[PDB]
Amino acid sequence: QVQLQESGPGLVKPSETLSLTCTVSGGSISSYYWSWIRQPPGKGLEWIGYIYYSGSTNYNPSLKSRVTISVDTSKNQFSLKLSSVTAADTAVYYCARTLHGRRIYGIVAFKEWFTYYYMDVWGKGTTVTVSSASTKGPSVFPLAPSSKSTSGGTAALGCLVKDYFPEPVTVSWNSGALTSGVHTFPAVLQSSGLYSLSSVVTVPSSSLGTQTYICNVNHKPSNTKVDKRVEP
Amino acid sequence: SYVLTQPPSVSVAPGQTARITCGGNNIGSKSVHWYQQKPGQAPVLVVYDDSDRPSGIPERFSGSNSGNTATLTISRVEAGDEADYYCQVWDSRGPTNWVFGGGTKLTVLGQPKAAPSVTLFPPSSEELQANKATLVCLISDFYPGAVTVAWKADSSPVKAGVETTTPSKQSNNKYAASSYLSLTPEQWKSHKSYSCQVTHEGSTVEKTVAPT
């Protein structure tokens, strides 16, 4: 299980430089290629560039002048810098492990082959919003289970995550230990320009009395971390 | 640069075979790769070097490449196969070496209907103690993905302070949405109850909550 994990600022101001890092775990940078890809809202995939573990690079011509990709084999990481951003650079950015292939279709002495690349393991994506607006961390409130949120053998309880900017926030339960039954709803964008969302977990109703449920909310752009206990 | 041409959309009924094409200019002499992107998710490699299956990819997916057309064939299509599909090749010549197709939306026709499950939460004591109040109406497991939400204070419609999301697909191929009603604690305390009323396909599910 090689895993890739993007880390970025979430919010970057117009004209400034976007900086991202991808941390590889469960495998090595060595011997592989490593790409950045982005996808602006409602658009297709745009490959930005790759880097070989040795440092050799290749870039898409459309971003070439503003981008630099680097690699750090000592930390099993690789990174991207994008200069002079505007709102056109607002997008989800992905990192992906990239493989080199060769098809030898004829005789090797006749150099009758060609090279190709493809991306086999993807990161989860990091959302980057280019905006002059200020970050705001959320308030977090418990959504208590009750006879009005039960459905026989199961019950719903949750956390309300209110008034943040920009996207995203991540919500885990019991520090990530509780995953089954977890439903984090997409955010609403309110007229105030601020987002709100709810995360709900469905649990056994018979044992609501004796179990402990805590929602962990992380909003990276504001460095907000909240743990909220949710009980009847 | 080298041009990859995909249909914007392909529609099929469950159990049928879907075919997604990628043209073309002697694409048969190149190596074609395919990616699936489900709604709200990171892309996933589903075919490489024309026909190679990555580990974990369902048997129903099959890549082929010939002449001026590469095809991704999905047999026995399921609702879960709905996604955007992109073909991709690497062009040595340049200038654009990494070419993605524009992508094809696969739509699955005639999926079963599902009425929404609705849960309504009253304001928390914590939020009230901070002099605010929010009602939270969570709507899940419905299909098709269109609903309308109406709020009532007692039996009177209320439109101010309402924020509602557009539906988005869940992991189980049905849809979810949420609606929020902002109130003052005074307003919350002054009515006998508030209700969230959800209309889907002409039928309505209503949940009510009341102070304490």
Numbering used by the authors:
A (entry chain H): 1 to 82, 82A, 82B, 82C, 83 to 100, 100A, 100B, 100C, ...
B (entry chain L): 1 to 9, 11 to 95, 95A, 95B, 95C, 96 to 106, 106A, 107 to 209
Copy the relevant paper text.
To identify less-mutated intermediates with broad and potent neutralization, we used deep sequencing to study the development of neutralization breadth in the donor from whom bnAbs PGT121–123 were isolated. These antibodies are among the most potent bnAbs described to date and provide protection in macaques at relatively low serum levels. Thus, the PGT121–123 family of antibodies are promising vaccine leads because their high potency suggests that even modest titers of antibody in the serum might be capable of contributing to protection. Previous work identified only the N332 glycan as critical for PGT121 neutralization and binding.
Much work has been done to demonstrate that complete reversion of VHDHJH and VLJL sequences of HIV bnAbs to the corresponding germline sequences generally abrogates neutralizing and binding activity, which suggests that some degree of SHM plays an important role in the development of neutralizing breadth and potency. Many research groups have generated germline derivatives or close equivalents (unmutated germline ancestors) of known bnAbs, but these constructs do not bind most recombinant gp120s or neutralize most virus strains. Indeed, the putative germline of PGT121 was unable to bind gp120. Crystallographic studies of a putative PGT121 germline Fab, which is similar (0.4 Å core RMSD) to a previously reported crystal structure of another PGT121 putative germline antibody, suggested that the mutations from germline not only involved likely antigen contact residues, but also involved structural rearrangements in the heavy and, most notably, light chains as a result of somatic mutation in CDR and framework regions. In order to determine if residues in the variable region are a result of SHM or are due to polymorphisms in the donor, genomic DNA from the PGT121–123 donor was extracted and V and J genes from both heavy and the light chains were amplified and Sanger sequenced. Based on the results, there are no unique polymorphisms in the donor that distinguish the germline sequence from those reference sequences found in the IMGT database. Additionally, the sequence results indicate that the deletion in FR1 and the insertion in FR3 of the light chain, which are present in the PGT121–134 mAbs, were features that developed following VDJ or VJ recombination. However, the intermediate 3H+3L antibody did bind weakly to monomeric gp120 from multiple isolates. Overall, the results confirm that, while SHM does enhance neutralization breadth and potency for this family of antibodies, we are still able to observe relatively high levels of broad neutralization activity with substantially lower levels of SHM than found for the most affinity-matured antibodies.
